[PDB]
């Protein structure tokens, strides 16, 4: 029996994100665009009230309770615990890099990395998905779906109109879990970008 | 010759940005899916400071100069090879009494690319009316956001396109966008959220 937290993250969580963020940048074939640091997630990530910008919601896991909320001290937000069985013990190689404290048996499993945007054929506010990660010991026993399910309960209090992610067209597993979530994946959509180096060009036109 | 000013919208100008999001829905063949309304965007577009959150970029275009000029507005003039024939030109007047035409606008707001750990811009419409195309305009709009990204140390901008889209590809190419073939877009409806929403958790 194991139990779980849904939480905003802090600036105490900052090596937590960034590794989490470098193995999306694994998975995703991308480590040559990692250039992310720990110094840089802690001069951007915590600068706004939660949800008015980027946003982390952290999944913990540990086989003690946590404690209890009891009285809230947030307007928006209080952490989603719950109870469960899974059927199988959890082999973790790098539990050690994902505890917020080394003296207690809460792990950091997870993450969804957000903020908001505008689907303006619907004139308001939305939100985008930027990370939705799971470590792979604690795949397929229903947190990945708790981590969506938080961002969406999140985005109905803020009468939000929609949520958008990305996700590269050979990521199998994703894109199914994303379709058995209820979400559409489109075929037509193509992404576009201007890097840094793009940027500068641009800026030097006279 | 003529005249272009790149400035922020403002409330007032809710009704040309209606009108343009409606052509953008037309073009990309998705009416279905146009229901935004003037109320809806007044109530949403300014409730916060420019570059802060949704912001929008106005591309107006007139045969006489502006009134001299963290935002100055962006000022440009050419020579354009013939004149105009703009049927809505009616319906784009911030002042209908003086010869200044909303032409295109771009609206977009932060977004943030973990891979860099910084704060980016997504352009979620970047449009020229067709009376305005191949004239230049849709590059000074782009040019404006770029130049106001490298000002805030923005560190990347994002958007997206339709595959079949070539004429946008070719100018967003142009501009020295890559466009990709990998990525697909992923969607939560509305309908949907507060249908996921009924887990108590
Ligand atoms: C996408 C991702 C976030 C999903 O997280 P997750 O914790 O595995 O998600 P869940 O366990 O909630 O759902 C997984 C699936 O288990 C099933 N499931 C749902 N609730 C469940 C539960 N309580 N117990 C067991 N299975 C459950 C569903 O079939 C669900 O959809 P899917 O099989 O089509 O994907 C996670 O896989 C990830 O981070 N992936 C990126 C890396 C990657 O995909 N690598 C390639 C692997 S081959
Ligand atoms: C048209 C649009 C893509 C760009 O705005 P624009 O003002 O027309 O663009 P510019 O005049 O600044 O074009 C800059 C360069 O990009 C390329 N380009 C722009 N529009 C192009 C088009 N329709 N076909 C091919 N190349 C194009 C050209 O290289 C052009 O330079 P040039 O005119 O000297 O050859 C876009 O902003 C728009 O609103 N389009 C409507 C919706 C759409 O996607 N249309 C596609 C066909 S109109």
Redo the contacts between chains.
Sequence with gaps: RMFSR?RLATPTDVPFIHKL?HQ??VFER?TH?????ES??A???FNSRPF???TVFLLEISPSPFPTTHDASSPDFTP?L?THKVDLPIEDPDREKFLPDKLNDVVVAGFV?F???????????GF?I??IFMREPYRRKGFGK?L???V??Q??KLG???????????NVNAINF?EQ????????????????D??????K?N
Excluded: H
């Design positions: 849904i963020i999306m940048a991308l665009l990692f250039v992310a640091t840089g997630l001069s951007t990530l008015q910008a980027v989603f719950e990395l903020f908001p945007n505008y689907p303006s054929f619907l004139a308001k506010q985008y930027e990370d708790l969506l399910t938080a969406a309960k985005a109905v939000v109109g929609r949520v958008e992610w990305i996700v590269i067209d050979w994303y979530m209820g979400a559409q994946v489109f075929k037509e959509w193509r992404l576009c970008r201007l890097t840094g793009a940027l500068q060009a641009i800026d036109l």
